[PDB]
Design a protein around this ligand. Structure first.
Ligand SMILES: CC(C)[C@H](NC(=O)[C@H](Cc1ccccc1)NC(=O)OCc1ccccc1)P(=O)(O)O[C@@H](Cc1ccccc1)C(=O)O
Ligand SMILES: [Zn+2]
Length: 307
């Protein structure tokens, strides 16, 4: 913590700790990474995105966000390891070097900071944002039911008290609108990855309809390859397939929106485990989870570079 080299990647961190880490990675790798503020949360916290870039102007780009659901702590812990990994492998890893020599990567480690801080202070199992519905005593909106793709349809709830409550209208949550404005404005995103836990699944569109996506054949083959690369390290098994078919029906999910904006490689990872620890995954599993997930993410980015 006097350098990202001495930061402890094998434990779970607080919001102050992860925000300070982003400042330190940018100070140590000024030619590769920068910190962008893309918005403010409902209670006033900055929403930051790390940009990894070799140069250029508006290059094709890859989006990755983690922590949209705050109790899924392995996802923010995996994102901190990804960020260091990126600065360790550029130059060393030949395909990763080749991706970053043609494209940029945007990494949002804490997509829901109010929920995150709330999981450290009052409820470890908090999922939603902290929007206050003054109609109810129930707080927050499920930010992964707030996107404008099948919004309001089966797979989300109209009660503010539901864990799956969609909000009063699409993009009502500022932490969803912040991504939406930034991605649309950028205009050159090629892949959109949103990481969750748990279940060990690789998911692609759609969640709000049983109809197949036009590109189902291609995405199924990328998912198949990505899941094989991941299992190569420690034998971890993943299942993959469309959201509605593989976990359950869900409307207003971010991957369905991005795919409908024309971003073809739209995938959600559900990380470890399959329920034995669930959201409370032991810290001794952070680095093995991050390492095998990298192999899965790298496979998809390779495919995106190549076509
Ligand atoms: C446990 C894991 C499946 C996470 N889900 C959750 O945390 C859910 C939320 C919920 C509550 C009530 C009713 C329905 C759903 N709650 C929950 O308790 O999960 C139980 C469960 C696990 C496995 C299978 C089936 C059910 P996750 O948030 O990662 O799942 C994604 C799936 C998804 C990804 C991408 C797009 C849409 C949906 C999501 O629900 O937003
Ligand atoms: Zn989730």
């Amino acid at each position: 913590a006097r350098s990202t080299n001495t930061f402890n990647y094998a434990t779970y961190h607080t919001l102050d700790e992860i925000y300070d880490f982003m400042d330190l990675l940018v100070a140590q790798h000024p030619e590769l990474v920068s910190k962008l503020q893309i918005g403010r949360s409902y209670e006033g916290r900055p929403i930051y995105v790390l940009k990894f870039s070799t140069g250029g102007s508006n290059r094709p780009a890859i989006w990755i966000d983690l922590g949209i659901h705050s109790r899924e702590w392995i996802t923010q812990a995996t994102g901190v390891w990804f960020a260091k990994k990126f600065t360790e492998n550029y130059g060393q890893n030949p395909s990763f070097t080749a991706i970053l020599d043609s494209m940029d990567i945007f990494l949002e480690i804490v997509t829901n900071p109010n929920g995150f801080a709330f999981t450290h202070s009052e409820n470890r199992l908090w999922r939603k944002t902290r929007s206050v519905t003054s109609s109810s005593l129930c707080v927050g909106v499920d930010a992964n039911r707030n996107w404008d793709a099948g919004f309001g349809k089966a797979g989300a709830s109209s009660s503010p008290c539901s864990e799956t409550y969609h909000g009063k209208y699409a993009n009502s949550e500022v932490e969803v609108k912040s991504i939406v404005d930034f991605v649309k404005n950028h205009g050159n995103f090629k892949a959109f990855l949103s990481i969750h836990s748990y279940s060990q699944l690789l998911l692609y569109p759609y969640g709000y309809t049983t109809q197949s996506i036009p590109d189902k054949t291609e995405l199924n083959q990328v998912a198949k390859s990505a899941v094989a690369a991941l299992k190569s390290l420690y034998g971890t098994s993943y299942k993959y397939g469309s959201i509605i078919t593989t976990i359950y029906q869900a409307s207003g999910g971010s991957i369905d929106w991005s795919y409908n904006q024309g971003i073809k490689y739209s995938f959600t990872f559900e990380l470890r485990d399959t329920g034995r620890y669930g959201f409370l995954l032991p810290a001794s599993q952070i680095i093995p989870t991050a390492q095998e997930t990298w192999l899965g993410v790298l496979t998809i980015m390779e495919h995106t570079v190549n076509n």
